[PDB]
């Protein structure tokens, strides 16, 4: 999640694990 806009909740880190961008 390089872009400024956040897809997930704040605080949580964005991980590119699963096929789809997620927050873990």
mmCIF file of C-alpha atoms in Angstrom:
data_model
loop_
_atom_site.group_PDB
_atom_site.id
_atom_site.type_symbol
_atom_site.label_atom_id
_atom_site.label_comp_id
_atom_site.label_asym_id
_atom_site.label_seq_id
_atom_site.Cartn_x
_atom_site.Cartn_y
_atom_site.Cartn_z
ATOM 1 C CA UNK A 1 0.000 0.000 0.000
ATOM 2 C CA UNK A 2 2.441 2.658 -1.275
ATOM 3 C CA UNK A 3 -0.292 5.107 -2.274
ATOM 4 C CA UNK A 4 -1.514 7.675 0.288
ATOM 5 C CA UNK A 5 -5.104 6.422 0.362
ATOM 6 C CA UNK A 6 -5.629 3.726 2.991
ATOM 7 C CA UNK A 7 -7.830 0.744 2.138
ATOM 8 C CA UNK A 8 -7.725 -0.807 5.609
ATOM 9 C CA UNK A 9 -8.050 0.673 9.097
ATOM 10 C CA UNK A 10 -5.322 2.917 10.572
ATOM 11 C CA UNK A 11 -2.414 1.523 12.567
ATOM 12 C CA UNK A 12 -2.526 -1.846 10.820
ATOM 13 C CA UNK A 13 0.315 -2.494 8.377
ATOM 14 C CA UNK A 14 -0.355 -3.351 4.732
ATOM 15 C CA UNK A 15 1.059 -6.662 3.506
ATOM 16 C CA UNK A 16 1.246 -8.002 -0.049
ATOM 17 C CA UNK A 17 1.071 -11.624 1.060
ATOM 18 C CA UNK A 18 -2.178 -13.036 -0.305
ATOM 19 C CA UNK A 19 -2.964 -12.633 -4.006
ATOM 20 C CA UNK A 20 -4.878 -9.497 -3.064
ATOM 21 C CA UNK A 21 -3.475 -6.543 -1.137
ATOM 22 C CA UNK A 22 -4.355 -6.947 2.527
ATOM 23 C CA UNK A 23 -3.626 -5.503 5.962
ATOM 24 C CA UNK A 24 -1.784 -7.635 8.518
#
